[PDB]
């Protein structure tokens, strides 16, 4: 239940301005205060306030009390106003901040499952590794199987060739040995066509 | 022609090598086995003239699933 | 061979703190097979016997070692790992969707948590009884200190 903002407008904090205005209608702005002063001076005048020292007691103790309300009391209301406003501010953050946490947990909730829902690559990468694998293997082996017949095949025509080359070349040698081995005709008939060279 | 017609009986001197490897060398293959071994050496470390049997291995594999 | 394109980042994120030696070792291996697979060829350039047929001057052997080669047959390895990754990972997905659905519900536990704070009476027009049950923090510890103030008195 919210409290009401403002009290109840009393007048020299002693009389409620309740009454000022129940005698207006029938004694006008005055009719309050000529019936205070009419009180007043009826319990002067009779007797029925006697003055004493209490009157002196009474008139300093309310003149403090009127200076004490009159000087401090702008600052004992602005303090008590501040102590709410102070204990106000401090609940409202409190608030944000629990609001702010519950928010922080659902974001990383959504976080944590959208991570989750990244997890399959684990699982497709060991695929991947394990067909790349045997496919490497795979080329491997055809790899060796044709280098290993095209290699027994060169091999043979390579021993074949430098076979021939090396026979050519005793074949060769052969035949240069054989002129050795063994007429001016030519040599004439060169002597003749060196004539005719002139 | 003297010297076409003395090459063509030489050719022939030579080509008579029904029974001659090498034509009457009497050498040169202590020579030719220190070639041919290089040569089969270097194309390989086998019988050559048989075809080879092929072995084939398989991929090693781990415990791959998360531990 | 019909591979999975994969974000490599994104694999990071996913890898518990245990195991990150694994994964990028699994990782390295990747990379190298990727690599052996891009510069070997697919299918050995095979050869005519011609060059093979007029140099080699042995009795038929080239043709039977040609023979011998159109009829070989080459052992194609299998699998023999796919499909237990493929349970693993079925058996995963399991565990990742129950998970999901425990987080389902702490968020909407959150949200009524959340509507309840955003939906507070105004702090001015609360008794005490009503903050404890907003922030039970502010509740008074009347087990450990039963007499007045209940706190201690610096707290005061």
Known sequence: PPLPEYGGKVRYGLIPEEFFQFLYPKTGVTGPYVLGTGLILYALSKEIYVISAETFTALSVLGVMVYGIKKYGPFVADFADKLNEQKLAQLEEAKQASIQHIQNAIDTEKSQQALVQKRHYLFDVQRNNIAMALEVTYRERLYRVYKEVKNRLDYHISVQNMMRRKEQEHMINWVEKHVVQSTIAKCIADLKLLAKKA | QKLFVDKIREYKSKRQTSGGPVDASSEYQQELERELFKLKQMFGNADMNTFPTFKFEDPKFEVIEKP | ?156
Request: hydrophobic residues 40%; negative net charge; contains cysteine.
């Open chain 3, 1 to 156: 061979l019909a591979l999975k394109t994969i974000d490599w980042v994104a694999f990071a994120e996913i890898i518990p703190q245990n195991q990150k030696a694994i994964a990028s070792s699994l990782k390295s291996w990747n990379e190298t097979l990727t690599s052996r697979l891009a510069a070997l060829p697919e299918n050995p350039p095979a050869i005519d016997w011609a060059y093979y047929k007029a140099n080699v001057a042995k009795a038929g052997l080239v043709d039977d070692f040609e023979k011998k080669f159109n009829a070989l047959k080459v052992p194609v390895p299998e699998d023999k790992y796919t499909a237990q990754v493929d349970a693993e990972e079925k058996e995963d997905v399991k565990s990742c969707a129950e998970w999901v659905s425990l987080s389902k519900a702490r968020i909407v536990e959150y949200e009524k948590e959340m509507e309840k704070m955003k939906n507070l009476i105004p702090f001015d027009q609360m008794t005490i009884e009503d903050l404890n049950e907003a922030f039970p923090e502010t509740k008074l510890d009347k087990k450990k200190y039963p007499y007045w103030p209940h706190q201690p008195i610096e707290n005061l």
